[PDB]
């Protein structure tokens, strides 16, 4: 097959920046190059064909550029729902290549999280499993330290993290965190609590509940 | 070995159905000496009687049951079961009393792909009616006449899938089974082998 | 209005076959090439080959040669993908998209959503909903999905007429080989008593639908 790299792999950019990405093909593909950005979850969109044509709707931002074997994509200047992996493809003949992509994620300021506990449902705990869930709502950057205290007693083993993806709109982002017990070891303790230390916080916040109470 | 009362009788007088505070008494029965009521109800809950909705777990309470000695009958079951699992081991029903004094087998409006009672050998008297089970196949190829241990006892199976439906989307006898029929698609779910 | 639509993903155990279907509208496939495209979970896209409905020309990607065919019924309307002797590593989205006349290349201009494929040796189960209960200004409740197999589920909330100050949480896969995940919505507090906030659940890989009042605790 014609080979297709793409660089960067990554890239975190502010609104506004200028974006370039590269793609180089093992041989000449004259200008038979498309773009396309993808979104999480969603299917890719073509941006870009004949390597510079702007396909129908695209906004202006997007350019693209080169012949041979070295090709650009340009984003003139970065919007927040510009959030997305980027991908080059060899677009004539079979098999029609496709980089490996490059993901573009969103800069802004520093926002702290807005943080929540969920106890178990009754209807869980019936069931003899204990769920608690922390949640961390709207926040800036990523990086976040989430930690589950039971009866102070630091947790370990026992939790598991999901965050979303970056908004579209704000550039932040929201983070779930499930602590797991059985609802023997649920009812022997007390106290339920989730600390979190972020860039956005002063010092850690904790959110906790008495069971039962 | 241990009976137990039905749904009417005993600790089950006034119950309209098996449900959630009553079920416990259940616990190891291996005869229901009397009938047993399986209700939308149930499943919902019941606000008067005090009555929490039932965990459908709760129903494998009932796989120690080998014998009915009234009638069975299911109009709400857990959507989520493809078949009447907590009855897998229910061998006979002998309908010595009857719904509406002609039924001893009602399975009514669930959302069941089988019947799966591999255990049943007999249904004594009594007519059996299987209605409704939208998603509902094989019933048709058990040979009813078979089970039953009264002349004139009837079968009659109304507004399941589709016999064309069951056959195009092979929800048919295994191979392996015998013309007697069968409960299921498995070989497990056959009346007899080949 | 030109939309491509696929169907037909879910759990296939290691050996077993599946065909995918692509639903075209606002277009003929007859007189169009549509291609086969999938992505493996946090990976690229792999092409896989294409067909011209009119004529029934197809051509496949070496690594799928012999295993997966392309066909269309042109009085449907629709494409279908035939996946034989599936393995653990084929576990991946997989799109139909409609190769663009804006030019001789083969640049794709509409795509479907995609289907999910799960290749294993484990079994289906559909979720387990519990609520996250509110009140704990603004306040925060949700629905905790738990314990299902294969991916994936989708959450809506009031059949999708409440869509602002949702999250709906990748899922992360359980010590026990179960997928879980919450949903969550921030709603004034004010609402509570005079708003009801349901969660509706889609498994379709097991065909589950499941609906969840989540409200204040008593
Ligand atoms: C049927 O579904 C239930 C869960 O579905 C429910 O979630 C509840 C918490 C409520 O919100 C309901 O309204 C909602 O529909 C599953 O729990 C059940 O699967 C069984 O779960 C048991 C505990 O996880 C487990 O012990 C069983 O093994 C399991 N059944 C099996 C054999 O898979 C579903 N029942 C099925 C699939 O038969
Ligand atoms: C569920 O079963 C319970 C029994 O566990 C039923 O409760 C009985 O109800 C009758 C009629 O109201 C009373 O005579 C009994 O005193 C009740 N017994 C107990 C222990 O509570 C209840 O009625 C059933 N509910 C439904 C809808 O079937
Ligand atoms: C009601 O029963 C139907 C029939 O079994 C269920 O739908 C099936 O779900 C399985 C996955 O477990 C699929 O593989 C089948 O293809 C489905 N059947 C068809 C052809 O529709 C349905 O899930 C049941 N309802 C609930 C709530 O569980």
């Known amino acids: 097959d014609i080979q297709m790299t793409q660089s960067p792999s990554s890239l975190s950019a502010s609104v506004g920046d200028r974006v370039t990405i590269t793609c180089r093909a093992s041989?000449?593909?004259?200008?038979?190059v498309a773009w396309y950005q993808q979104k999480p979850g969603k299917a890719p969109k073509l941006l870009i064909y004949?390597?510079?044509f702007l396909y129908s709707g695209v906004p202006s931002r997007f350019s693209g550029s080169g012949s041979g074997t070295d090709f650009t994509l340009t984003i003139s200047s970065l919007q927040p729902e510009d959030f997305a992996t980027y991908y080059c493809?060899?677009?004539?003949?079979?098999?029609?290549?496709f980089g490996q992509g490059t993901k573009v994620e969103i800069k802004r300021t520093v926002a702290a999280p807005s943080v929540f506990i969920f106890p178990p449902s009754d209807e869980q705990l019936k069931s003899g499993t204990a769920s608690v869930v922390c949640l961390l709502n709207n926040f800036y950057p990523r990086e976040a330290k989430v930690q589950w205290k039971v009866d102070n007693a630091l947790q370990s083993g026992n939790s598991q993290e999901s965050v979303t993806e970056q908004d579209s709109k704000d550039s932040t982002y929201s983070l779930s965190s499930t602590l797991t017990l059985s609802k023997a070891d649920y009812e022997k303790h007390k106290v339920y609590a989730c600390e979190v230390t972020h860039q956005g916080l002063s010092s850690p916040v904790t959110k906790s509940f008495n069971r039962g109470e | 070995r241990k009976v137990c009362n039905g749904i009417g009788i005993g600790e089950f007088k006034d119950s309209l159905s098996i449900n959630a505070t009553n079920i416990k008494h259940f616990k190891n029965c291996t005869s229901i000496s009397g009938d047993l009521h399986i209700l939308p109800v149930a499943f919902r809950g019941d606000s008067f009687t005090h009555t929490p909705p039932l965990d459908p777990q709760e129903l494998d309470i009932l796989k120690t049951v080998k014998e009915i000695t009234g009638f069975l009958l299911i109009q709400a079951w857990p959507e989520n079961r493809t078949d009447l699992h907590a009855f897998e081991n229910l061998e006979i029903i002998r309908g010595r009393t009857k719904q509406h004094g002609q039924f001893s087998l009602a399975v009514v409006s669930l959302n069941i792909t089988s019947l799966g009672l591999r255990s049943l050998k007999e249904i004594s008297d009594g007519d059996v009616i299987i209605s409704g089970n939208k998603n509902l196949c094989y019933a048709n190829t058990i040979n009813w006449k078979k089970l039953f241990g009264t002349s004139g006892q009837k079968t009659k199976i109304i507004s399941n899938r589709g016999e064309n439906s069951c056959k195009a989307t092979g929800q048919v006898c295994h191979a392996l089974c015998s013309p007697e029929g069968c409960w299921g698609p498995e070989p497990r779910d056959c009346v007899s082998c080949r | 209005e030109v939309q491509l639509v696929e169907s037909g993903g879910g759990l296939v155990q290691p050996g077993g076959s599946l065909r995918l279907s692509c639903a075209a509208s606002?277009?003929?496939?007859?007189?169009?090439?549509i291609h086969w495209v999938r992505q493996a979970p946090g990976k690229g896209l792999e092409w896989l080959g294409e067909?011209?409905?009119?004529?029934?020309?197809?051509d496949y990607a070496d690594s799928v040669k012999g295993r997966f065919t392309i066909s269309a019924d042109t009085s449907k309307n629709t494409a279908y993908l035939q996946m034989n002797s599936l393995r653990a590593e084929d576990t991946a989205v997989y799109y139909c998209?409609?190769?663009?006349?804006?030019?001789?290349?083969?640049?794709?201009?509409?795509w479907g959503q995609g289907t999910l494929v799960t290749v294993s040796s484990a079994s289906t189960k559909g979720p387990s909903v519990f609520p996250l209960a509110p009140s704990s200004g603004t306040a925060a409740l949700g629905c905790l999905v738990k314990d299902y197999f294969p991916e994936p589920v989708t959450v809506s909330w009031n059949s999708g007429a409440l869509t602002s100050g949702v999250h709906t949480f990748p899922a992360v896969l359980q010590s026990s080989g179960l997928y879980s995940l919450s949903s969550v919505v921030t709603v004034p507090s004010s609402s509570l008593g005079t708003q009801t906030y349901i969660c509706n659940v889609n498994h379709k890989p097991s065909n589950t639908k499941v609906d969840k009042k989540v409200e204040p605790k008593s």
């Open positions: 606002g277009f003929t496939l007859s007189g169009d090439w």
């Open positions: 004949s390597a510079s």
């Open positions: 998209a409609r190769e663009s006349r804006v030019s001789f290349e083969a640049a794709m201009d509409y």
């Open positions: 067909i011209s409905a009119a004529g029934g020309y197809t």
């Open positions: 493809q060899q677009s004539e003949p079979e098999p029609y290549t």
């Open positions: 041989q000449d593909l004259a200008t038979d």
